[PDB]
Amino acid sequence: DKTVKLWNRNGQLLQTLTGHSSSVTGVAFSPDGQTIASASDDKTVKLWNRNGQLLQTLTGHSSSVTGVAFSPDGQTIASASDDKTVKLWNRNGQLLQTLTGHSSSVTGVAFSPDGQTIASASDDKTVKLWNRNGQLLQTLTGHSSSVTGVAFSPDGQTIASASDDKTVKLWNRNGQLLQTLTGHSSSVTGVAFSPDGQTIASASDDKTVKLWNRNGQLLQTLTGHSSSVTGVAFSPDGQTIASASDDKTVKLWNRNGQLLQTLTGHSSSVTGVAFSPDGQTIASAS
């Protein structure tokens, strides 16, 4: 619906961020909690303040931007694009690096917890790992279809990837495949680690979030969305799970799988969700 919405944990809408000229595909909070970054099919990243207003527009990608992330220190923004690149930007919106190496669209991006490695997911079926000088360090091969999302474990030693092959895969930094999470019945659209590292959450077009242990065994299936689930996130305290869906909602769930809230207000599909660092604000992209 071309907006980002900001909500509290009780379901109350706080702000609507208007200005993108096409779909918003992803959202992230800065580590100080004051700035929100959004990615859009209009080929831009926008930076917004939590009071609801646009600060900056980062132009430069030549196709849709599919995801955005902040470094742990807040000083670098990473964006993924169908132009086959990841771009790294400073907080002035100046372009620092373009990471080239993927041979098709880049669908997601994440920073390692130490801020020194970037992971990218691509339709070329790979995850690539990079440093902040744009140098390619490793390619993770094994998915049999497009990779849709990527995340680092809190200790930084395990990478999780989501794929249209219906799996999540877990890897080390040397590119070794460690575990495959098999169980979704359609494409997996996103993956996240709990802050203690002991639960993995995955989102799927099968309309569920699944929760798994670190051996890749299914622990719970969260049912309730009425269309594809497009993203998932854990709150910083680990006590709340957020899911985004083509049913136009975000749902909030406790760790026991109980539905806590549905965030209703977007007028089209929700494509991503994020928690503020204090865990009290949720951002949704649509």
Author numbering: 0 to 285
Task: Give verbatim excerpts from the published study on this entry.
β-Propeller proteins are common natural disc-like pseudo-symmetric proteins that contain multiple repeats (‘blades’) each consisting of a 4-stranded anti-parallel β-sheet. In the larger propellers a so-called “Velcro closure” is found, in which the N- and C-terminal β-strands are part of the same β-sheet, keeping the propeller closed. This “Velcro” can occur in different positions; in the “Velcro 1-3” variant, the closing β-sheet consists of one N-terminal and three C-terminal strands, while for the “Velcro 3-1” variant, the opposite is true. Starting from a highly repetitive β-propeller sequence, we designed a consensus motif sequence that formed a perfectly symmetric 7-bladed β-propeller.
